Write a protein that binds this ligand. Structure first.
Ligand SMILES: [Zn+2]
Lengths: 51, 287, 286, 191
């Protein structure tokens, strides 16, 4: 469709004859992905005393 | 033992199907089967062409489907006329006209069943107005090159009329496959039913084109000549100076009133001549 | 319903090829098929067509065969190659709109609820466009017959796609209205329009031959439109209309005057630009 | 066998829905086809059957098709309503043969006559006349208890087989509730 190809939309192009063949979602930098799925600690509010 | 005068006649209609299917899947390499009839030992003529469904994602002509081939062929005969598959066509979006490694491999398959099969490549982007760009091809045996004997046994100055494209020559042109001259068949019934049909109108001749809007168009165009003409004066004095080539290059960033003024005048005279003429022609046709 | 129906050149060509492919009988026989295409904003487009077998004896035109299975089976083939195109109607050479082609539409009404039949002559030697597109419209009355169902015409023109146009213009390379200006307009709309007007007017005169030798007992409605046609004729050119025309015909001449004068000046300067060129070349040479 | 193609001519007249045989002459018809279509196949594994209605006008349900289940299923939803137009009925089946599959199949159509038949002779001879011209033999099966012996088709069938033209034959059934069963044996046996 030629209505979701708005300016800024990521689009994949063919290797030989450059032609848009798919509109893609905005990419997530792998650092950002690693920046979210991080915490295994599971610290509770009952451990931070005094504050 | 080919005759290097093959002259594959295509059609006045098979070409349109080839182009329409080629542009439909422009990113990919659609493939289909040509239904023509061998006539001479020197010419192979196609009559009709039917497409083959795309297997899915992937710009390739990997393989043909035997069952789909039979179903359509056994269905066209009972209404049209029987025809034998003589070749296959696949559209190259913008690469050019040649055969790749896969295309060569798929081609020998057809040649195995039929000795004189013809492969055709259609380019739907490069062809623009008067050039269609097809350049049908065929494979050369590897034994001959191993033997070293040149194939096609030229016996007439007919095949060496089109200079091979350098882009095609880079690939296996005259090394792994040889081109066959392609011409077309045209008849008046076909032409008169296409040329005298494409751009025509029924009754637009006697239409006065919004008489209120016509003079408004004139006012805007003429008003543009008032400023355009004034710049013409300033464009005549500074001209006729030394190094006219310098003058010629000096008109590459700013509008030139010499051409712009003429363009407006051309449209102005035709619009009124037609618009005025229809006024008197109508005044006699209708009462 | 549908304002207009655009017919691509490929469909036009696939019908000529169909007639010659089966027309070995020679004398006369229609050819009937199934049209394909898509429409947007109430404007139909026809792109592909395939031949449906169809035979019918001439006498007692209430017998005919159209292969439903062939229509269903083949459409499965065309659907796979291109999903966008779906059945939209049917075509048949049928230069004269044979009578039985009002129950055939009911046969094809199943696949396309609102189907259109486009009559495209295979042997045209004429001036008008060879593509008439009709749509089925229903209304029962007490004049014609208890069962009333008649076709209503929809304007049809020959379209063009980017890919088809490349081939179509290459295939011709025969004649083109080059330098499309005052030359094509004086011939592509003025003279041709008059030719068409005369033929349509002559067609009306031929029907009015029923005044002496009755063919149909006065269609009534046809007369009604003809009366309205005459009243709509432009009012006699003797009143204030004449002044209005002159005040506008002459107003258009001023612009022509100004355009011509500018043309002469530019033409004169062009001659000066060139004439000084060879004089300078000749003077230096000798 | 012998690469035959039969184009069944079903009947759906309004007076055809009375059950003087057993489950009305609608299931009696459906069982009748089953014992022929399957019988029509199983000899050459390339045959073809097509059912056509003899209702008011051109009403054809299934075209030339090797499948067997389509006809049976398509037979349903065939509730009878209206008169029968025999004279213009065979010709419709006639065209189906002309536009057939590979023409190497022998052409024949079995008739399924029924509720009171209408004909004016003379024309029927012409109706049989043409079909007998072009390598076509029809099989009208007397049914539905028409006039005894149906002495209007009698002048019809003989025309096709005339001049020692051995082929299909007229078959009748007792007015009583004689089950269709294998009673139809004249054409299937050798014709
Ligand atoms: Zn390729």
């Amino acid at each position: 469709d030629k209505s979701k190809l708005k300016p800024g939309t990521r689009v994949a192009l063919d290797m030989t004859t450059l032609t848009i063949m798919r509109y893609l979602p905005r990419e997530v930098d792998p650092l950002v992905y690693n920046m979210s799925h991080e915490d295994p600690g599971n610290v509770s509010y009952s451990e931070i005393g005094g504050l | 033992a080919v005759d290097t005068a093959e002259q594959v006649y295509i059609s006045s209609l098979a070409l349109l199907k080839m182009l329409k299917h080629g542009r439909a899947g422009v990113p990919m390499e659609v493939m289909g089967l040509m239904l023509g009839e061998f006539v001479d030992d020197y010419t192979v003529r196609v009559i009709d062409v039917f497409a083959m469904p795309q297997s899915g994602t992937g710009v390739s002509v990997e393989a043909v489907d035997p069952v789909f081939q039979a179903k359509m062929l056994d269905m066209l005969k009972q209404t049209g006329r029987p025809e034998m598959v003589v070749g296959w066509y696949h559209s190259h979006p913008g690469f050019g006209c040649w055969l790749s490694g896969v295309d060569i491999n798929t081609q020998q398959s057809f040649e195995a069943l039929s000795e004189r099969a013809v492969a055709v490549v259609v380019d739907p982007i490069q062809s623009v107005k008067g050039k269609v760009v097809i350049d049908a091809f065929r494979l050369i045996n590897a034994n001959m090159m191993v033997l070293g004997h040149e194939p096609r046994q030229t016996t007439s100055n007919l095949g060496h009329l089109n200079k091979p494209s350098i882009q095609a020559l880079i690939h296996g042109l005259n090394r792994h496959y040889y081109s066959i001259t392609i011409n077309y068949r045209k008849n008046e019934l076909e032409q008169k039913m296409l040329l005298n049909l494409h751009k025509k109108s029924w009754m637009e001749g006697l239409t006065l084109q919004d008489y209120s809007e016509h003079c408004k168009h004139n006012e805007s165009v003429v008003k543009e000549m008032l400023e355009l003409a004034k710049n013409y004066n300033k464009a005549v004095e500074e001209e006729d100076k030394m190094t006219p080539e310098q003058l010629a290059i000096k008109n590459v960033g700013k509008q030139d009133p010499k051409r712009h003024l003429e363009e407006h005048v051309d449209v102005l005279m035709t619009s009124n001549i037609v618009q005025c003429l229809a006024a008197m022609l109508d005044t006699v046709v209708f009462k | 319903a549908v304002q207009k129906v655009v017919v691509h050149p490929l469909v036009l060509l696939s019908v000529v090829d169909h007639f010659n492919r089966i027309g070995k009988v020679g004398n006369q026989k229609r050819v009937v098929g199934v049209l394909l295409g898509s429409w947007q904003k109430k404007v139909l487009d026809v792109s592909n067509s395939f031949a449906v077998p169809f035979d019918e004896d001439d006498k007692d035109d209430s017998v005919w065969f159209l292969d439903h299975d062939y229509l269903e089976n083949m459409y499965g083939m065309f659907k796979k190659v291109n999903a966008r195109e779906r059945i939209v109607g049917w075509y048949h050479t049928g230069p004269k709109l044979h009578k039985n082609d009002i129950a055939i539409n009911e046969l094809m009404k199943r696949y396309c609820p609102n189907s259109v039949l486009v009559i495209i002559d295979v042997k045209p030697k004429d001036l008008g466009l060879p593509t008439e597109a009709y749509i089925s419209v229903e209304e029962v009355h007490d004049d014609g017959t208890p069962t009333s169902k008649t076709f209503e015409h929809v304007t049809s023109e020959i379209g063009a796609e980017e890919a088809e146009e490349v081939g179509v213009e290459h295939l011709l390379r025969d004649i083109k209205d080059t330098t499309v200006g005052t030359l094509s307009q004086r011939i592509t709309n003025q003279v041709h329009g008059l030719k068409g007007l005369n033929s349509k007017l002559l067609d009306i005169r031929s029907y009015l031959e029923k005044v002496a030798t009755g063919k149909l007992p006065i269609n009534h409605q046809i007369i009604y439109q003809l009366q309205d046609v005459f009243n709509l004729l432009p009012d006699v050119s003797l009143q204030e209309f004449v002044k209005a025309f002159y005040l506008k015909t002459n107003d258009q001449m001023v612009v022509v005057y100004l355009a011509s004068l500018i043309r002469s000046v530019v033409a004169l300067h062009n001659l000066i630009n060139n004439k000084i060129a060879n004089r300078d070349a000749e003077k230096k040479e000798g | 066998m012998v690469l035959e193609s039969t184009m069944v001519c079903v009947d759906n007249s309004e007076y055809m829905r009375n059950g003087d045989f057993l489950p009305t002459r609608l299931q009696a018809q459906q069982d009748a086809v089953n014992i022929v279509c399957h019988s029509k196949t199983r000899s050459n594994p390339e045959n073809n059957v097509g059912l056509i209605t003899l209702a008011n006008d051109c009403e054809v349900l299934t075209t030339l098709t090797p499948d067997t289940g389509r006809i049976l299923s398509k037979l349903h939803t065939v509730q009878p309503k209206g008169k029968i137009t025999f004279c213009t009925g065979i010709r419709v089946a006639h065209l189906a043969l002309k536009h057939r599959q590979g023409k190497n199949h022998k052409m024949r159509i079995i008739a399924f006559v029924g509720s009171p038949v209408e004909d004016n002779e003379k024309d029927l001879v012409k109706l049989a006349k043409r079909l007998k011209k072009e390598k076509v033999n029809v099989d009208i099966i007397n049914f539905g208890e028409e006039e005894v012996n149906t002495e209007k088709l009698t002048a019809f069938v003989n025309t096709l087989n005339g001049k020692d033209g051995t082929g299909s034959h007229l078959v009748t059934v007792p007015p009583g509730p004689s089950l269709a069963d294998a009673l139809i044996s004249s054409p299937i046996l050798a014709g």
